Structure formats: structure tokens, C-alpha cells
Amino acid sequence: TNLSDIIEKETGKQLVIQESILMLPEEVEEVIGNKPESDILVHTAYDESTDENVMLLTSDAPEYKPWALVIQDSNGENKIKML
């Protein structure tokens, strides 16, 4: 699993990707601010140690190019990192 390796590399977290969604560029913009050139896959993991949702944002399969990382707290606040 390279996808969780990227997450580990960025956060030091060793996590299991539990789910994904595909988002249109315009949906992304409203959440991330910056607008991607195409669809992005939201790879969602949970980390109970800190109770945060960790979501890695990549390009569509099969390329999976990292584009951003979101760490979201219990309250739903997003910390957004561009990759």
C-alpha cells in the first residue's frame, strides 16, 4: 500500500484507507480553495489515537498522483496541506 505510505510520510501515521469518493473539480474548490485540473479521489482513513479523519487527495485511478492532504478534527475543522 503506497497510498498509506504517503500518509505515513506526511504525518507519521500508519493508517488503513477505509473508503473513497470521487469529486468533481468544482466540489473540490469549495472545500480546498485551490481548483484541481480534473477529478480527485478522496482517500479516507480514520485515526482513533487523535480522533481525526485523515484524507489523502489524489488524481483519478490509475495514476493516483498526490494533490493534497486534509486532517479534520472532531469538530469538522479542516487543516489543508497542498502536495
Binding site: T1, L3, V16, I17, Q18, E19, S20, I21, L22, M23, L24, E26, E27, E30, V31, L41, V42, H43, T44, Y46, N53, M55, D60, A61, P62, V70, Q72, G76, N78
Partner: protein, 271 residues
Amino acid sequence: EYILIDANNYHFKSWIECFPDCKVNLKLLLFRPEWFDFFKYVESKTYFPQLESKLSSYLEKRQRIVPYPELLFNTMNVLPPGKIKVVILGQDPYPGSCISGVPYAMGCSFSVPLNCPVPKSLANIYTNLIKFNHMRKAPKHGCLASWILQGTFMINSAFTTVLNESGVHARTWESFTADLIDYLTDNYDDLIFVAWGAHAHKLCQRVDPKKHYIITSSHPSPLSVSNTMTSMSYGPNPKKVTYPSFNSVDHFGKINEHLKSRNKKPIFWDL
């Protein structure tokens, strides 16, 4: 018993254990006869060749397809078309596995086997039910067998993916899903379609909005739950419209209120 799954009692045949001859036949995985009319339509169409062949390629390569084959048409084998009260579309199946190696994916949207960790988008479904008093406390498990038996047609628009990979089969399953949706809106009458997120909303654009009831919101995934969702209305004259965030909508209340109104049995949601 094909929908009441437990990862401490899981010996479902793997894809390759199912087809060591990498030739994939899908006829075999559909057990319930009421779906035969629909299937033989799809069998009689251009893509089903490609589909089975495209699927075979994956076996050849050799990629671990999920859910496993006996689970593929789970919802259909449990639920005949004339007994489905609600259509709830997922997009991708769950990509991950239990530490044992049991896959999360179990043939129907948003559900996981017993004794499997519960992914947050399903957790958010539980939070919603609790919010609107259809549930007192979140269950220990994430198996939604009970709902499906009561007529909840819970399916992913991509029927398969690859273990620990996402989105990889969305397009090869595209035609088949639109054909399933068309089949339901054309040949049945008072169905409830639930559109969670842009994509489900897109699929529900093929639903006849005067035969069927449509509930529309953002997707229950952590990044979406609290946000709105914007696209076109369903009409003949579409306007650009914002739909409510998932956590703000009494989905299951609306489902039941409608069912009652048409003299149908409401669905019991609690687990």
C-alpha cells in the same frame, strides 16, 4: 445468510478460487430468478461481452477483486425488484480489509460484515439516525442486512474494485448501472431514490421525477457530511440548485413518512 456476513465466520470463495479458469461468467453469481428478466436484457446488450472480458483481464493480472463473487449481487439475490422500496446508491465499494484479510466490501453499499471496523461514512449514517430519533444508540457493528431485507436496495454504482485500491472499475461498470437504474424507474412505480453526493445525484437524473420520490443531499463521507452540494435540479427545465448537507436531512424519516403515505410498511432502522 448471504447478507448477514461475519468476519469471524468468513470463508467466501475468492475471485480466483471462483474462476481458476480466468474466464468470468456473471450469470452464475445471480441466484434469484426475479432478476432474470432484467439480466437477460443486459446479456442482450453490447457491453456485457466487454464487461465480462474486462473483468477477466483483472483476474489474469492478477488483481484481488472485491467484493468476492458470491457477494457481488448480494442485494439482488436477497431483494427481488418488486419488493424494493428504496434505492440507495454508493459509488465505490470499500477498498480495505480486516487485519485477518477479510475485505470490508460485501456486495452492498455502505455495509460491512459483522466484527469488521465501521467506516466513518456509515458512522455518519448512524449519527443521522440518532439525531432524528430513529435510533437510540449506535450499534457495535456495521452490517445493514436488516435494512436490505426490508426493501432497502443498497448498491454501489461500481460493483467491484481492487483490494486496497479505489475507483479502478468505476467506468467498466458504468453501462450496467445505468441499465439497472433505467430498469427500476421504467418498470416500477413508487420507488424512493436516495441521492447522496454529486454522483448519485447524476444517476438520479435518469429517474422519472413524477413516478418516484427523490431525496438529495451531500455524501456522508467525512469531507462532505457537513457541506452542501451544488448541481442541476431534476426537472425538464433544470436550474442550478444547492442541496443540503447530509447531516441536516432526516433521510430515514422522510423515507418512512412517504412509505406510510402510500400505505406501505415503514422500515425499522434501529440495530
